[PDB]
Amino acid sequence: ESSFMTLFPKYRERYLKDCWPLVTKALEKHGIAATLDIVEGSMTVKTTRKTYDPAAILKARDLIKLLARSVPAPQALKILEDGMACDIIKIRSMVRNKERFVKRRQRLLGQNGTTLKALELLTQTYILVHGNTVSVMGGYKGLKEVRRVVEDTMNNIHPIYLIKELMIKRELAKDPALAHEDWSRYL
Amino acid sequence: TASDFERLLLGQPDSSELWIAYMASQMQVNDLSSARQIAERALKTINIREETEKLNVWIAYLNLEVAYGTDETVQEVFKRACTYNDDREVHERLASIYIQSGKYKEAEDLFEKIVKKYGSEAPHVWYNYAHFLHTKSNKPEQARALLKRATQVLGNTKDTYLYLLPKFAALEFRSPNGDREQGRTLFEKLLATYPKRFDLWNQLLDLETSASSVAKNPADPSVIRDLFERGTKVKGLRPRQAKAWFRRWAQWEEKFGDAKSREKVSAKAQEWARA
Amino acid sequence: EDLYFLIKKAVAVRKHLERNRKDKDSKFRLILIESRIHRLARYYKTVGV
Amino acid sequence: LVFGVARIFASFNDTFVHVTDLSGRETICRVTGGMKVKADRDESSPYAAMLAAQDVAARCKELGITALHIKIRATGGNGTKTPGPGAQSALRALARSGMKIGRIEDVTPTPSDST
RNA sequence: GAUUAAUAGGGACAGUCGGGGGCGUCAGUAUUCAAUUGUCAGAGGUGAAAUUCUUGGAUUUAUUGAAGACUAACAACUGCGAAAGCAUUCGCCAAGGAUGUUUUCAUUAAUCAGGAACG
Numbered sequence: 001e002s003s004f005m006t007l008f009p010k011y012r013e014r015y016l017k018d019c020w021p022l023v024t025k026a027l028e029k030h031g032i033a034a035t036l037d038i039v040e041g042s043m044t045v046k047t048t049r050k051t052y053d054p055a056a057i058l059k060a061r062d063l064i065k066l067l068a069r070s071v072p073a074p075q076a077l078k079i080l081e082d083g084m085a086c087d088i089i090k091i092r093s094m095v096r097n098k099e100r101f102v103k104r105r106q107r108l109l110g111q112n113g114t115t116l117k118a119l120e121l122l123t124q125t126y127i128l129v130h131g132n133t134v135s136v137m138g139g140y141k142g143l144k145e146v147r148r149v150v151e152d153t154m155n156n157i158h159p160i161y162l163i164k165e166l167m168i169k170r171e172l173a174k175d176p177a178l179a180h181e182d183w184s185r186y187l
Numbered sequence: 188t189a190s191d192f193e194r195l196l197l198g199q200p201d202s203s204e205l206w207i208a209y210m211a212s213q214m215q216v217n218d219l220s221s222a223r224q225i226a227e228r229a230l231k232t233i234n235i236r237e238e239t240e241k242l243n244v245w246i247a248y249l250n251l252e253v254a255y256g257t258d259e260t261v262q263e264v265f266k267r268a269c270t271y272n273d274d275r276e277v278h279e280r281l282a283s284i285y286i287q288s289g290k291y292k293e294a295e296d297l298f299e300k301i302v303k304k305y306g307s308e309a310p311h312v313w314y315n316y317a318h319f320l321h322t323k324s325n326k327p328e329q330a331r332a333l334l335k336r337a338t339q340v341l342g343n344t345k346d347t348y349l350y351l352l353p354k355f356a357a358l359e360f361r362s363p364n365g366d367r368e369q370g371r372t373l374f375e376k377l378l379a380t381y382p383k384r385f386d387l388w389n390q391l392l393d394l395e396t397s398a399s400s401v402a403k404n405p406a407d408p409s410v411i412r413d414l415f416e417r418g419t420k421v422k423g424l425r426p427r428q429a430k431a432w433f434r435r436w437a438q439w440e441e442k443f444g445d446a447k448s449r450e451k452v453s454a455k456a457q458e459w460a461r462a
Numbered sequence: 463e464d465l466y467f468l469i470k471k472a473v474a475v476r477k478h479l480e481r482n483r484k485d486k487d488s489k490f491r492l493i494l495i496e497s498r499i500h501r502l503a504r505y506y507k508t509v510g511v
Numbered sequence: 512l513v514f515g516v517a518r519i520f521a522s523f524n525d526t527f528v529h530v531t532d533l534s535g536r537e538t539i540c541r542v543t544g545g546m547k548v549k550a551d552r553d554e555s556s557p558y559a560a561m562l563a564a565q566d567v568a569a570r571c572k573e574l575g576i577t578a579l580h581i582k583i584r585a586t587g588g589n590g591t592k593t594p595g596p597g598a599q600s601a602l603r604a605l606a607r608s609g610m611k612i613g614r615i616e617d618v619t620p621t622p623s624d625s626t
Numbered sequence: 627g628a629u630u631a632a633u634a635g636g637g638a639c640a641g642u643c644g645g646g647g648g649c650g651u652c653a654g655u656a657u658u659c660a661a662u663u664g665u666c667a668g669a670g671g672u673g674a675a676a677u678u679c680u681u682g683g684a685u686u687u688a689u690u691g692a693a694g695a696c697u698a699a700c701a702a703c704u705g706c707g708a709a710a711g712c713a714u715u716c717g718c719c720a721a722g723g724a725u726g727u728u729u730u731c732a733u734u735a736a737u738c739a740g741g742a743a744c745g
Contacts, residue, residue, distance in 0.1 A: 002612075002613075002614045002615045053603070054602050054603055054605075054606040054607075054612065055599045055600075055602060055603050057615060058583075058594075058598075058599065058602070058615070058617070059599075061617075062593075082557075082596075082599075083596065085593055085595070085596075086593060087591050087592075087593050088592075090698075090699095092698095092701080093625065093626055093696085093697090093698075094626065097711090098711085131701090131702095132701075133699095140523055140555075140595065140596060141673070143523070143591070144523060144673095145673090147591065169673070172673090173673060173674090179674070180673090180674045180675060181674085181675085182674095182675080182676085183673090235476060235477065235480045236480060238480075238483070269649090269650080270481075270649075270650080270718080270719090271481060274649080274650080304650095306693095307693090307694075335659095335660095335692095336692070336693080338659095338693090339658095339659070339660095339692055339693040339694080340692085340693055340694075341693090341694085342694065342695095343694095463637090463730095463731075464636065464637045464638085464730080464731065465636095465637095465731090467636095467637060467638070468636085468637075471637095471720095471721085474720065474721090475720065475721070477719090477720080478648085478719055478720035478721080479720085481648090481649085481719065481720080482648050482649060482719080482720095484648075484649095485647065485648045485649090485719095485720090486647090486648095486743080486744060487646075487647050487648085487707075487721085487744085488647065488648075488719095488720070488721060489743075489744085490708090490743065490744065491647095491720090491721055491722080492721095493742085493743065495721095498636080501734085502636075502734075505733080505734050506731075506734080508734090509731085509734095511731095516687090518686085518687065520685090520686070524670080524671070524672075525669070525670075525685085527669095527685075527686060529686060529687065531664075531686095531687050531688080532664085532687090532688095534688075535687060535688050536663075536664065536687070536688050536689085537663095537664050537665090537687085537688095538664040538665050538666090538686080538687055538688095539664085541664095541665075541666075541685095541686065541687085543667085543668070543669075543685080543686090544668095545667070545668045545669070546667070546668075549668080551670085551671080551672080551674080551675075552672080552673085552674060552675090554669095554670090587656080588656055588657060589656080589657080620655085620656065621655080621656080621698075621699090622655060622656035622657080622696085622697095622698070623654055623655040623656070623696075623697055623698050623699095623714090624654085624655055624656045624657080624695065624696045624697065624698075625655095625656065625657090625695090625696075625697095625698075626695085626696070
C-alpha cells in the first residue's frame with residue numbers, strides 16, 4: 001500500500017460526486033481502489049496488490065491533482081495513456097501588474113477562444129486556464145512548446161505571431177529535404 | 188560659564204556646535220551625567236528638521252560614552268541612534284570612532300556585523316573593512332577574501348562590481364602592505380573582463396602615474412611606458428580619448444624628464460593620427 | 463480645543479516624519495493636516511481669536 | 512529483504528537512473544540515455560529508459576538488493592516540475608524486471624521564491 | 627445680551643479593521659558560488675544541431691558554508707492605500723476607514739484659474 005491524496009473544493013464536490021463512477025471504473029480497470037470523502041473533501045487512491053502496472057499510481061496522483069484543479073474528469077482519465085503528461089504554469093508572479101496581468105490573460109484567451117483552438121490543434125494538446133494557473137496536456141514536445149507560448153504571451157509577444165511561428169514550424173518540419181539546419185531566417 | 192552657555196542656547200537653540208561645546212565644558216568639569224543631560228536636552232530642544240545638527244549631537248554622545256562610559260550604555264545609545272537616525276550611517280560613525288579610539292577588536296566585530304547587515308547594497312562598507320585591514324590590523328589576504336565575499340554579496344550591476352574591484356585595487360595601490368602588485372592584479376583582471384572601458388584604463392594610468400610604491404612613494408616608469416603602449420594598442424579609441432592619452436603620456440614624460448621618450452610620445456601621436 | 467488637538471497631531475506627525483524622513487505617504491498626511499491647520503486657523507482667526 | 516534508493520532525474524531531454532545507498536551517499540550505479548541509445552534527439556525516450564532500467568536492474572540484481580524505494584524529481588527550480596516518459600517507462604520496466612517496491616515517493620525541489 | 631443643532635461640518639473617546647506606510651527583526655525555500663565525498667562517460671541544447679563542460683570527473687547523490695532574489699500551494703466577481711501599488715513571523719512608530727457615544731467652536735461649507743507633493 002502506497003497512498004496519495006489532496007483536497008478539492010466545495011464547488012467541485014458536486015462535480016466529483018456525479019462524476020465519480022467512471023473515475024473509479026477506470027481505476028478498478030487499473031486495479032487500484034479510490035473513494036471520495038465528503039465531510040472533508042479528499043480523494044484517496046490506494047494501490048492494491050493486484051496492480052500489474054506500476055505507473056498507474058503516479059498516473060493516479062496526476063489524476064487527483066487535475067481533479068483538484070478542476071480539470072475535466074475524463075481528460076484527466078485520458079492522462080492514463082502513454083504520451084500524455086500534465087503541467088501547470090503560474091503567471092500571477094510572472095506579471096507584476098494586476099490589470100496588465102488581466103489584459104494579458106484575456107489576450108491569451110483571444111476573441112472567442114479561436115486562438116486557443118488554433119494552439120491546441122497545432123500542438124495536439126488541451127488547454128485550461130484556471131486564472132493564476134494554466135492547465136496543459138499532450139505529448140511532451142507539445143508541452144515544451146505550449147510552455148514557450150504561455151511565457152511569450154505573458155512577455156507580451158502576440159499569439160498571432162506565435163501561431164505564425166508554429167505553422168511555419170509545422171510545414172518546415174513536415175518537409176524532409178530541409179531536415180536539419182537553423183531555420184530562423186524563415187521565422 | 189553655564190549662564191553664558193544658557194544665554195547662547197537661548198540665542199541659537201539649533202547650534203549643535205555650541206551644544207557640544209557646552210557638554211564638552213561639562214566633560215571637562217567631569218559631571219558626565221550632566222553632559223548626558225545636556226546632549227539629551229539637545230536632542231529635545233534643537234529644531235527638529237536639522238539632521239546634521241542632531242547627528243552631530245549623536246556622534247558626540249557616542250564619543251562621550253566610548254570615552255568615559257561603559258559597554259552597556261554604548262550599546263544602548265547605539266540602539267537609539269539607529270532607531271532615530273540612519274542605521275548604516277551610525278554604524279559607520281561608530282566604526283570610525285572605534286578606529287580612532289584604537290579598540291580594534293570590537294571595531295572588527297562591528298565591521299563584521301555591518302558587512303552582514305548593510306553589505307547587500309553598500310560598497311563603501313567593504314571598502315572601509317579593506318581599509319582597516321590594509322591599515323592597522325595588517326590582513327591583506329583576509330581583505331582579498333573579503334573581496335571574494337564582496338563579489339558574493341553584491342549584485343553584478345556595474346557600479347557594485349566595477350566599482351568595488353577598482354576601489355580595492357586603489358586601496359592596494361595606496362597601502363604598501365596592500366601590495367600595488369595586487370592592485371595591478373585586480374586592474375589586469377578588470378581590463379581583461381572589460382577591455383572597452385577607457386575610463387578604467389585612464390584610472391589605471393592615474394594610479395600608476397601616481398605614488399604607487401607606497402613603501403618609498405614613487406611611480407614606476409618602465410611599466411608606465413608599457414601600459415601607455417598597451418593603451419595605445421587596444422581597440423576602440425575615439426580620437427579625443429587618443430589625444431587625451433597621448434597628452435597624459437607626454438606630460439608624464441615631462442614630469443620624468445626623459446626628452447627622448449617625450450619625443451617618442453610626440454612621434455607616436457603623429458603616427459597614430461595618421462590614419 | 464479642536465485646533466489644539468489638530469496642532470497636537472501635527473507636531474506628532476512631524477516628529478515621526480523626522481524620525482524617518484523617507485516616509486512620503488506620511489509626508490502627504492502631514493501636508494494634508496497642515497492644509498487643515500491653515501484653513502481652520504484662518505476661519506477661527508476671522509472671529510477674533 | 513534489503514532496501515535501496517533509486518533516484519531518477521527525468522528531464523524532458525535526458526534521463527538519469529541513479530541508484531544510491533539507503534543513506535543516499537554511496538552511488539551504487541548510474542546509467543544515462545547516452546550510456547543508452549546516445550541519440551541527441553532520442554536521448555529522452557521510453558525505449559532508452561527501458562535500456563537504462565534493465566542495465567541497472569541487472570546490476571542491482573548482480574549485487575543482490577531485490578527491492579528499492581524510488582525517489583522521483585524533475586527540473587524543480589524554475590522549469591517544469593513534472594517527470595518524463597523516461598521516468599514512467601523506467602519504473603514500469605524496473606518493476607517488470609522484477610523486484611518489489613515498498614512505498615513510492617516523488618520529491619521535487621519546489622521553490623517558494625522563483626520570481 | 628447666545629435660534630433650529632444640519633438627514634454638510636472637523637474633532638474627542640472606546641472597541642475595532644486593514645497582504646496601508648516606514649524602520650528593524652524572524653523564518654522559508656529555490657538559484658548561484660565554494661567545499662567534501664560516492665562518482666565515472668557522457669552531460670547539454672535542440673524541432674534536429676552546434677557552442678560549452680567533460681578521467682584534475684562534467685551531469686549526478688548527499689551534507690554544509692556564503693551570497694542575492696522572492697514569499698509559491700491558502701490568493702478571492704475579496705481587503706487596504708488617492709495613485710503608482712500592497713502578500714513569511716514578530717516588534718516599534720506615527721497615520722487612515724467604518725461603527726457607536728449620555729462629545730464639543732456653530733459656518734466653519736462645495737468648486738477649481740495661479741501653484742505645490744507623490745510616478
